[PDB]
C-alpha cells in the first residue's frame, strides 16, 4: 500500500513549531528503510526502538508531527529534555517510543531577506504536558493583568520569530524535525 | 528525584574481585546511561566504563579494557559492575554518575556529547 | 586526549570573579558547531554534581554565576560571584570519546 512519507517529509509548505501538525499514517505498508538517505547528516535518533529493528516490528499507529525548529534545539526535542521548546513549545513522553529525524534544511527555508514565516512561543505560564499544542495567541503577562489585551511595556506577546539566512552558524541553520511518535502499519 | 544510590564496596585484597551494584530509581532506568567515574584521593576523577540502557555495548578505560566488567540489570532498576583481578593503584571511591541525555539508538548530527547530570555517593575500595 | 586545567588552585577571595581554564590535545569543537568540555565540581565530602555540559549551556538548577566560555581548545569557566558556597575542586570532562579524559582538577 506504501504508506505516504512522500507528504510530512517533501511537502512543499514547512509547519512551525507550536502548530505542529501531528499527521496521524496508519492502515498501510510503511518502509523505514526508505528515510536513511537523505539528510547526509540525518538525526533518526531512535527513542524506544532500534532504527534498524524497527523495520520488522509495528505498532498501533504513528504520528510524525514534523515542523521547523533551529538546528542548536535540534537537540532539544528529545524525550527528558528542559529547553525553550521542551518547556513550551513541544516534549516528548519519558516513556517516548519513537524516531526523532531531523536534518538540516537550509535551502527553501531561507531568504536572502530571511524567512519569517516561523514563530516559536517563548512563554508561558505552565510547561506542557507531554504533546500538547497551543495555538493561543492571547497576550502573556509576564508581569501584571490590567486587562491584557495588547500591550508594550512587558506583558509580552508569546509567540516569536526566527532568523534565518546561509550566513548564519549551523546552530542557527533551520532544522526540520519529524517526531515520530508509535496494528495496521507495518511493512 | 533522580536517584543513584550505590553499595557494595569495601575493603577487599589484591589480587582477588569484588561486586559493586548502583540501584537506580526515580527516572526510567531503561532508557539512558550510566557511567563510573573513580577518584583516588590525591588523584584527580578517572573515568572507568559506561553501558548503553539496555547493554547495547561497552566500552571501558584504556587502564582497563577489560579486567573490568560491566553488566546492567533492567526489569529492577540495578546496575551491576564486576571488577577483576585489582593492583595496587586502584584503591579509589567508585561514583556511578547517571548522563542527563535520554540515549537513543540512531545517529545524530547533534550529539551534546556525554554528560554526567546525576550522580551517585561512591564507595570507597582498598586494595 | 589529556586535559590540564589552570589554575588547579585559584583560593579566591569571596566576591571578585574567578576564571578557571582547560587544555584540550584536540579541537573538540566538533564541525556541528559544538564545545564538549564539562565543569564537574565538589564540594568537600560530596559527590560531584554538573555544573556546565557542552561548555556554554549549563544544567538546569545552577546559578547564573556559574558561565563557561569556549573557544577551540582553550575553555573556561567564569565564576561571576564567589562566596561559601562555590568551594570545592572543579574538573574539565572531554565529552567527545571514549576514553573520557577527565581533566586534572584545580582548587578553591
Known amino acids: 500500500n506504501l504508506c505516504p512519507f512522500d507528504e510530512v517529509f517533501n511537502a512543499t509548505r514547512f509547519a512551525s513549531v507550536y502548530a505542529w501538525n501531528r499527521k496521524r499514517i496508519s492502515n498501510c505498508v510503511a518502509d523505514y528503510s526508505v528515510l536513511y538517505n537523505l539528510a547526509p547528516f540525518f538525526t533518526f535518533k531512535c527513542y524506544g526502538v532500534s532504527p534498524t529493528k524497527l523495520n520488522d516490528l509495528c505498532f498501533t499507529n504513528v504520528y510524525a508531527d514534523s515542523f521547523v525548529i533551529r538546528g542548536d534545539e535540534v537537540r532539544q526535542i528529545a524525550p527528558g529534555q528542559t529547553g525553550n521548546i521542551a518547556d513550551y513549545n513541544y516534549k516528548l513522553p519519558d516513556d517516548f517510543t519513537g524516531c526523532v529525524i531531523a536534518w538540516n534544511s537550509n535551502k527553501l527555508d531561507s531568504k536572502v531577506s530571511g524567512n519569517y514565516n516561523y514563530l516559536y512561543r517563548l512563554f508561558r505560564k505552565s510547561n506542557l504536558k507531554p504533546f500538547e499544542r497551543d495555538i493561543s495567541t492571547e497576550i502573556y503577562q509576564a508581569g501584571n493583568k490590567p486587562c491584557n489585551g495588547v500591550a508594550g511595556f512587558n506583558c509580552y506577546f508569546p509567540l516569536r520569530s526566527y532568523s534565518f539566512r546561509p550566513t548564519y552558524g549551523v546552530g542557527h541553520q533551520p532544522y526540520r524535525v519529524v517526531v515520530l511518535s508509535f496494528a495496521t502499519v507495518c511493512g | 528525584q533522580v536517584q543513584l544510590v550505590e553499595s557494595g564496596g569495601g575493603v577487599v585484597q589484591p589480587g582477588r574481585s569484588l561486586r559493586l551494584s548502583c540501584a537506580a530509581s526515580?527516572?526510567?532506568?531503561?532508557?539512558?546511561?550510566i557511567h563510573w567515574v573513580r577518584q583516588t584521593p590525591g588523584k584527580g576523577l578517572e573515568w572507568v566504563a559506561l553501558?548503553?540502557?539496555?547493554?547495547?555495548?561497552?566500552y571501558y578505560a584504556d587502564s582497563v579494557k577489560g579486567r573490568f566488567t560491566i553488566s546492567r540489570d533492567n526489569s529492577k532498576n540495578t546496575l551491576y559492575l564486576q571488577m577483576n583481578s585489582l593492583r595496587v593503584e586502584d584503591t579509589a571511591v567508585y561514583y556511578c554518575?547517571?548522563?542527563?541525555?535520554?540515549?537513543?539508538?540512531?545517529?545524530?548530527?547533534?550529539?551534546?556529547?556525554?554528560?554526567?547530570?546525576?550522580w551517585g555517593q561512591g564507595t570507597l575500595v582498598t586494595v | 586526549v589529556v586535559m590540564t586545567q589552570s589554575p588547579l588552585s585559584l583560593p579566591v577571595t569571596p566576591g571578585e570573579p574567578a576564571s578557571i581554564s582547560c587544555r584540550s590535545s584536540?579541537?573538540?569543537?566538533?564541525?556541528?558547531?559544538?564545545?564538549?568540555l564539562d565543569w564537574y565540581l565538589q564540594k568537600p565530602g560530596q559527590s560531584p554534581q554538573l555544573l556546565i555540559y557542552?561548555?556554554?549551556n549549563r544544567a538546569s538548577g545552577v546559578p547564573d554565576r556559574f558561565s563557561g566560555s569556549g573557544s577551540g581548545t582553550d575553555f573556561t569557566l567564569k565564576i561571576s560571584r564567589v562566596e561559601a558556597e562555590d568551594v570545592g575542586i572543579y574538573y574539565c570532562?572531554?565529552?567527545?570519546?571514549?576514553?573520557?579524559?577527565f581533566g586534572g582538577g584545580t582548587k578553591v
Open positions: 554518575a547517571k548522563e542527563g541525555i535520554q540515549g537513543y539508538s540512531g545517529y545524530d548530527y547533534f550529539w551534546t556529547g556525554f554528560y554526567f547530570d546525576y
Open positions: 553501558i548503553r540502557y539496555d547493554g547495547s555495548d561497552k
Open positions: 584536540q579541537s573538540l569543537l566538533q564541525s556541528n558547531g559544538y564545545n564538549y
Open positions: 557542552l561548555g556554554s
Open positions: 526515580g527516572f526510567i532506568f531503561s532508557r539512558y546511561d
Open positions: 570532562m572531554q565529552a567527545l570519546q571514549t576514553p573520557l579524559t
